[PDB]
Amino acid sequence: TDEVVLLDFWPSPFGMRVRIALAEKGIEYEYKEEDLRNKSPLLLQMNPVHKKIPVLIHNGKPISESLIAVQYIEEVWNDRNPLLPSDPYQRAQARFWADYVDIKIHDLGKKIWTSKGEEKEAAKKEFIEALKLLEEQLGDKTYFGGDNIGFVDIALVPFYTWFKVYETFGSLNIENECPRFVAWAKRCLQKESVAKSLPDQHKVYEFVVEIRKKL
Amino acid sequence: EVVLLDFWPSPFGMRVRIALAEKGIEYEYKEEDLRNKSPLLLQMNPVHKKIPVLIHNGKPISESLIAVQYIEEVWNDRNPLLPSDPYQRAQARFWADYVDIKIHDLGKKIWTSKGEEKEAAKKEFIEALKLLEEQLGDKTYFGGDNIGFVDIALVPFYTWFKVYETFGSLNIENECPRFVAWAKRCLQKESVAKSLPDQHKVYEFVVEIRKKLVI
């Protein structure tokens, strides 16, 4: 049979990306939970360069880097549920905004709960600015992908699950500042592929309380 | 129909120059002064305000590797820059990504820092080059018998190696001879040779910058 395996860790927004892609495409796979404090031989063998999850393993061959795995999924299971545009220019723009998520949302978000004072103030400001820029791109559309979820939705909506982390350690009210963004995230969460892939905000928060205290 | 906003010593712009030459695409090159950014640059890449920007019929594509993929997809029936096989494509994207993480920033630290920080940058930089030599293997190019995505992503940084060698006090030629021989093979292709400035030109550009710095 055609074997699909996903090496993952439940609160990771990067893993959630690949979970959504597999679910949206209707692909049967085996989910394997890693302890990143005791990485399995499989993980170390499949992703020697980064030793990170997620890793997608397709008939024994690995694809590391979440957005690269999502693109691999789109290209191999290409006969349903398109996740990227077919127009080259629109595809370039989807790639651009997914890239933007990596560098702004993830990086700045991490500073909100791991930094302090003037630096943490900066990230809070810039983070809200990034959210606002993303709201502008969404505009009045149902999803970033338009009528269906696409590459940018998949890149971005997992970070919503970390919003209580950002809000609580950052003393931010994101819904007050960015209501369009929060309504969009809630729309995504009504889709089975997203609902089943994303942990509850409070579960992520309680997990981060435990790891942050050691920092 | 095709315009490129660029700055001649930027390795990122060099990627797009190689892609355009490989495909035989006629275009207008426009040199930007990044201390006095043009209204067109600010109009076309408002988000990052960086070069390169590819502009196709008035529509901008920013981020060098996204632009290279756009070029591959639109002018798709000659000189493939990426594999058709999805797994091989994912691996090319993986190693291009690795280049994006490592080379520019470590290289920059080599000529702008001092002390232990500088020696740590040197060490990590050579480690990255060696990992890339390993991936190249016995292949002519990263892309196999012709240049591909990873070659395009990486060879521009070779134009900066006299900068790294001189200010870093290291001999990349001795430490990484397989890497340097590969770069010299690339420079024998017309598309690469015409896109890449001489190492000596890049070195003298940086010489005049660096002598003004208090490090």
Ligand SMILES: N[C@@H](CCC(=O)N[C@@H](CSO)C(=O)NCC(=O)O)C(=O)O
């Ligand atoms: N660019 C990559 C990032 C993956 C990542 O950070 N993964 C973490 C998840 S836990 O926070 C990871 O596996 N880290 C390994 C570790 O903490 O040792 C991608 O997009 O897949």
Ligand SMILES: N[C@@H](CCC(=O)N[C@@H](CSO)C(=O)NCC(=O)O)C(=O)O
């Ligand atoms: N991720 C991008 C990086 C482009 C970049 O750094 N561009 C520099 C070139 S000069 O060092 C730039 O335009 N910087 C603008 C500035 O210094 O203001 C890409 O791959 O295209």
